[PDB]
Amino acid sequence: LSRFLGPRYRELARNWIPTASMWGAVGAVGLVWATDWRLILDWVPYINGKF
Amino acid sequence: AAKNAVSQFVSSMSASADVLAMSKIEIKLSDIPEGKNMAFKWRGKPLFVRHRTKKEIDQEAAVEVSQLRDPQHDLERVKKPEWVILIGVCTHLGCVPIANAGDFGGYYCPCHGSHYDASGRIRKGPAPLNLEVPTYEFTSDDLVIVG
Amino acid sequence: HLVGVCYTEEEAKALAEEVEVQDGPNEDGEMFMRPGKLSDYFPKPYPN
Amino acid sequence: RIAEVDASVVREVCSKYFYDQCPAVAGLGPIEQLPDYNRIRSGMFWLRF
Amino acid sequence: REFGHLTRMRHVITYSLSPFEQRAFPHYFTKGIPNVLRRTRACILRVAPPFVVFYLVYTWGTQEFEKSKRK
Amino acid sequence: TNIRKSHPLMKIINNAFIDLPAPSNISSWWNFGSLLGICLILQILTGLFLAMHYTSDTTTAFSSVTHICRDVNYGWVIRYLHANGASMFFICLFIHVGRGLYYGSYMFLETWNIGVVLLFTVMATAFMGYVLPWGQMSFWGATVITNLLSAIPYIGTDLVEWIWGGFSVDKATLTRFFAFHFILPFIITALAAVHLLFLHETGSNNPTGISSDMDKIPFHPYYTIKDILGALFMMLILLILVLFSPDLLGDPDNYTPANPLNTPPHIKPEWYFLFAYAILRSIPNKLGGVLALVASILILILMPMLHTSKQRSMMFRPLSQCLFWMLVADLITLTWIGGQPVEHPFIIIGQLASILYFLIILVLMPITSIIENNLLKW
Amino acid sequence: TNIRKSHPLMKIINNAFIDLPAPSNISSWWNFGSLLGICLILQILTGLFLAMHYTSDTTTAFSSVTHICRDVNYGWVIRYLHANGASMFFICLFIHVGRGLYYGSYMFLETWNIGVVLLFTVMATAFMGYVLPWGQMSFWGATVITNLLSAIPYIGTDLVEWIWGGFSVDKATLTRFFAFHFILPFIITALAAVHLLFLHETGSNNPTGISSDMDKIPFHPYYTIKDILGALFMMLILLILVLFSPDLLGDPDNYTPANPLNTPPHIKPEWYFLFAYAILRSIPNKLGGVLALVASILILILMPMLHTSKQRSMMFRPLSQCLFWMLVADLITLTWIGGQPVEHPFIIIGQLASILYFLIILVLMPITSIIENNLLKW
Amino acid sequence: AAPTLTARLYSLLFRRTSTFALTIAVGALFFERAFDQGADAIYEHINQGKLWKHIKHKYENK
Ligand code: HEM
Ligand code: HEM
Ligand code: HEM
Ligand code: HEM
């Protein structure tokens, strides 16, 4: 289609990819806290949460 | 409100055992004499211990390298030639046969034409890969910590 | 239940050894007897 | 002085004067649905950015 | 969405009769049979030919599994 | 005054079921929404009876199910109500989805997207319950899913040794299968209330596709009596199965207890999972198999944006109706192939019918609607 | 588009919790309604954990409760959360009722009458759960109720041999106690939603008794932050009991298994049933005992028509406030007497305080409000 | 009119509201680094020579 294409659509995407990778990287580091993701737990070894 | 209210609720039902010292802690005895595979009810499915004879080695090393499509041999996984540890599920679906039946000395799967060998080999289709070997460390002389 | 409280795991198998117990039925035998397996409760003191 | 103004100048000067600031409010009736001062002051910060 | 707020309509009249003034079965097997023969004639050529294709594949499929065995 | 319009509880009942405006030409294909709500309540009450006598332990799971069919009073009728009531749920659910697809009801966007979520949650619920009796199809059904669930690239093997309690199959293994299976039908109930709340904003579609505000009738008494009659005709058919053929839809191999050492001659799931199983075995890969299984339910959510016709329903579109029943006759083919063994004729037929399921929805349907627009000059 | 005011789900949340008009002078006695809703959710989640490991059989009931405190991981913290969370529920419930009685909140007639129903249903729920562990108070507590429940004149002995499964005491006995105790907390939840629906028609009362439509504030953020703070202060006190004194409120005699043979030295219920037990043992009859026990909860429903004062709350009525705390100091007396043995001093004190509980509510309070009207010249 | 050090973080991060809701995640770190120095070490100090790992060096001599 061309209802969404234009110089104004990815205009506000270029303003929101900083609000996007922050959409994604927070949820990506949110996915280790929940289910005790143990192959990325000691990605940085300062979190010795498992006793 | 997060680090101890979701992060600690797994063990009641998770990795942590409830019987603690139980079966991969045990002092495995000769709980089956030489040449059979009898069921035991621990680690879920029967780990099949077997007393290994003097000429079952050359059943396993006379077979060369080409058409067995998964290279995982018996000099590498289990540390002693006269010892072995097995798990009772196939790679694709999950069957193991009735004991001591087969053509050249393995376990013949009557689903649609398979036959697993003794120490975790497959000659047949449509099985993709070899047998699960269980975790182990032969630490002792004769009290078996398999896991 | 005494491993890490007042005894180690050795010193605890070797105390369960000290009394043999009455296990269940098997073929080519009877309900046989055997020493303690470290999964045993403390042995009871009156038949019934 | 008008020709120098562009979109990044306007975007910068508005953040200096508006963004997390305490405003002053006056009202003359009937004003029962004029929103609370806490709800007005929370309307100065944003949701996404 | 309630009844007196749905649409705007002008110049149409409706006549209706009470349920206690009527017969339960005026015509049941003297219009019920030729009206379903009209509704069946309208649908058949859109619905039936895909299921005649499942039949010819079932019949050929369960005939090349029998002759694979015993020559 | 009128207490139906001024009482705080009776107002909600009156706006939802009594004075609701409804189209006058609604067919009996619109009966199956309340039939689904009857089938859900039936599975909940019957399942709460079986859960007081079931034991989740792999040494006594098969024996606690034979005990209720022989010892407990009225346990045999309640057990076979539950197994046959689940086949009744899945046949009404497939009629319901095929209705909304033929008549263009997916244009109610919030109502259609809550429905695709509800379809996943009942399919996962029925899978967990068929593990619980622990015969030789509960065993070889559980392992086929969870070695296919170890082909998730980075967290896959983490998730397979969580559901068995940490392990292979033991006493604590079917406590997690049982607790999921207990909880999910009560989330299905909450998602079905939100489902109807979004439909109350527009009212119903009708077989012509054309809006009908000029022709509404009240819901009571015209569709309160028509829905009671269809529910009685459904309780008749269900009891014909419980009392005259209670083992017709099941498999005999699930009356043998689970044995890793013995061998089952074939692997056949329930009839309502047989179409998904045929799409799996046509992909020689184990990452591309679990992808194409999940993409066959998730393709329903693309139906609003694939619509290129000027009209809403298929009543006046004769070329789109030949393609609709080519798609139904293709899901019958995939149900037959899923219960056959894997040899030569049933291996090429199975993958040429997995291609046709995606070629009709994604390519042939949006092109056929544009040809119809052009023959009517829009 | 304000999406808080136009979305179909977000509208309901906004009208109920965000933009709700509330009085500005609401005290922390108005905190205990949401504390009761926290205590109910806590008892449901913790109870659903204990029900996967409990066994309802009189040979293995006591042994399945010792197993979870010793074998199952985190079973000891979850069991003592449940026993101590039930004392937390009953202390918030008695604060809640005493609030609505002092400030005159019973004038909301539909809200007050749903509340008296909710008080019966939580008292019956907590009775069934204390039977389930089967020690020597679960035994001698069950028989004292059900030989008092054979003194119903025409259907009494029909109902006592229904709840034990038909027999005296056996395995199928605690399947009926367990199934009632499972189901009733989910009916309590449905009655508490209807409870708040009728309060939404008027809004809240306030400590002065005077209507406050000229001084409303929004519920968010002023009482969303004040209710979160009171809930955190309640989770602190509950964990002081679970982690530093988990056996303070219970009785030691329930750690001995039930035996019709041995003998318990005393019969003492839980602290929150001790006031009703003292009214029972003051009536030398068994029909007039079960009547006066049920009439001590059902007297709350006469509070709207016993009100003879010109003002709504007790803030400006100093003689009605001396009678309000004479009634609280009389329920403390009846709690102490209910845990004492039946000898000479505790037998006349117990029946002179059962008379005073009915003399204050029915006679002395409506006469004192008329004297106050006359000293103010209405 | 020299003020006190309140506005460390009013301008940079806690103004865009980003780090106001992120401090539950970004701000989850290094306090289970810092409170073993509390509760655990206070616990073994009140009970000195009474726990198992105090006295276990005797029978652990192989
Ligand atoms: C447990 C599952 C479900 C229940 C209880 C349920 C219930 C209902 C009910 C009572 C109606 C109104 C009456 C009717 O038209 O039949 C309805 C309508 C509808 N449902 Fe469902 N449904 C369920 C699942 C689904 C699914 C899986 C879908 C689609 C993927 C769906 C989509 C729709 C649509 C689009 C409508 C409106 C149709 C129209 O008015 O033409 N629902 N549903
Ligand atoms: C949408 C709802 C449900 C569906 C589709 C469903 C489906 C099933 C199925 C297919 C089985 C296998 C039965 C067999 O073939 O022998 C089963 C078993 C079982 N289900 Fe359900 N179920 C539902 C709801 C529930 C609920 C709500 C409960 C409990 C509260 C429950 C409890 C049980 C129990 C205890 C078994 C034990 C095994 C047996 O009785 O065969 N079910 N369920
Ligand atoms: C499980 C039981 C209950 C729950 C969850 C509950 C919940 C609530 C909540 C959230 C409120 C509003 C906030 C507040 O004023 O505290 C409220 C108010 C009220 N409740 Fe309850 N309640 C319960 C039991 C009762 C009982 C037993 C009674 C009386 C016999 C009662 C009578 C009232 C009254 C009269 C009000 C309005 C008070 C006022 O605004 O001054 N409720 N309840
Ligand atoms: C308003 C809600 C509830 C109250 C006041 C309540 C109260 C109680 C009490 C006082 C006990 C005796 C515990 C003891 O002293 O040892 C008990 C036991 C028990 N309750 Fe609850 N309960 C509630 C909800 C539930 C629910 C919803 C369930 C299950 C789904 C449940 C399951 C159990 C079980 C299995 C036991 C026996 C195990 C044990 O004694 O710890 N409870 N309950």
Ligand SMILES: Cc1cc(C)c2nc(SCc3c(C)cccc3-n3nnn(C)c3=O)sc2c1
């Ligand atoms: C016997 C019986 C009883 C009841 C109480 C009942 N209730 C429904 S749901 C009604 C509804 C709502 C709430 C919202 C939007 C649309 C519809 N609706 N409109 N047309 N049709 C066929 C619908 O179901 S079916 C049914 C059958």
Ligand SMILES: Cc1cc(C)c2nc(SCc3c(C)cccc3-n3nnn(C)c3=O)sc2c1
């Ligand atoms: C969304 C979704 C989820 C799941 C998890 C799922 N699973 C299947 S196939 C499972 C199966 C096999 C492979 C073999 C034997 C029996 C069963 N089986 N298990 N339960 N039921 C009722 C069965 O028929 S499709 C499907 C779709």
Ligand SMILES: Cc1cc(C)c2nc(SCc3c(C)cccc3-n3nnn(C)c3=O)sc2c1
């Ligand atoms: C933290 C928290 C969160 C929520 C979501 C919450 N919700 C309530 S219930 C609100 C209410 C309704 C729905 C209807 C009528 C009156 C009141 N209401 N009015 N004043 N007070 C003290 C009331 O509770 S408390 C509470 C506390």
Ligand SMILES: Cc1cc(C)c2nc(SCc3c(C)cccc3-n3nnn(C)c3=O)sc2c1
């Ligand atoms: C509405 C209502 C209903 C019932 C049924 C009820 N019952 C009692 S007294 C029961 C009892 C006795 C006599 C002796 C030992 C222990 C317990 N007992 N049983 N459960 N709990 C928590 C106990 O303390 S007041 C009350 C009020």
Ligand code: FES
């Ligand atoms: S099915 Fe396991 S070997 Fe073929």
